[PDB]
Amino acid sequence: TQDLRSHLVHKLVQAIFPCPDPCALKDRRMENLVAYAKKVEGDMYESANSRDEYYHLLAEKIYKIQKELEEKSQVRQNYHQDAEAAINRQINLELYASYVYLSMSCYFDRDDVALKNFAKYFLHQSHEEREHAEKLMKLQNQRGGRIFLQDIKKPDRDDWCSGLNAMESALHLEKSVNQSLLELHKLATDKNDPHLCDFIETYYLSEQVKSIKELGDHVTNLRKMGAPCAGMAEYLFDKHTLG
């Protein structure tokens, strides 16, 4: 339990205060800050019961300390924390979709698949999702909202079966992205945010609808021709549609 306590006491000095400055200021301020942090953590440890409640109280104290040192942006005008959380969730979903599309592109360009056009299409879709995520991040930075990048989840299905299952998974992912965008629009409308919801419904929903329609057409073609019931249909759809 020594390494855990060391990590917990070394992460709080960075979570409370960002980075000092030797040349601009002095050095005694960071020392006083870390001394006060050690004092308060010792006082919380001496007045604790178990292990989880102490960690919860320490996290609450860190949050309360960060409540003051925020430094809001001067460009922030009419923006709620719920909208920020929704934008963060949308960014996480976009990153997950880009990761899934990259995995699909890297799964079809192998030797046991031999579908270069499918890999190129999946790579183009991943690039489009990456550009959309970057545009969302830039729009959030222009409004003044903070961006907290977290971990990116991995696809639950490493083996995408064949082509029809991959197309169905992509269609379900696009439907989930559309539902998330609709929820974001509803939250922005309920929280007085016409600019963000209008930009989302104008420069994002159209591409989502087009992608959903294209994936539906691809699924219909794979079901009518015969995939994955026959390798001829996949080859013909590779050499004709995406070719």
Partner: peptide, 19 residues
């Protein structure tokens, strides 16, 4: 309190790190 997502983030981090 729980008004910001960093609440749930730090809660999940502490639940995953500490047994």
């Amino acid at each position: 309190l729980s008004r910001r997502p960093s609440y749930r983030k730090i809660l999940n981090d502490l639940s995953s790190d500490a047994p």
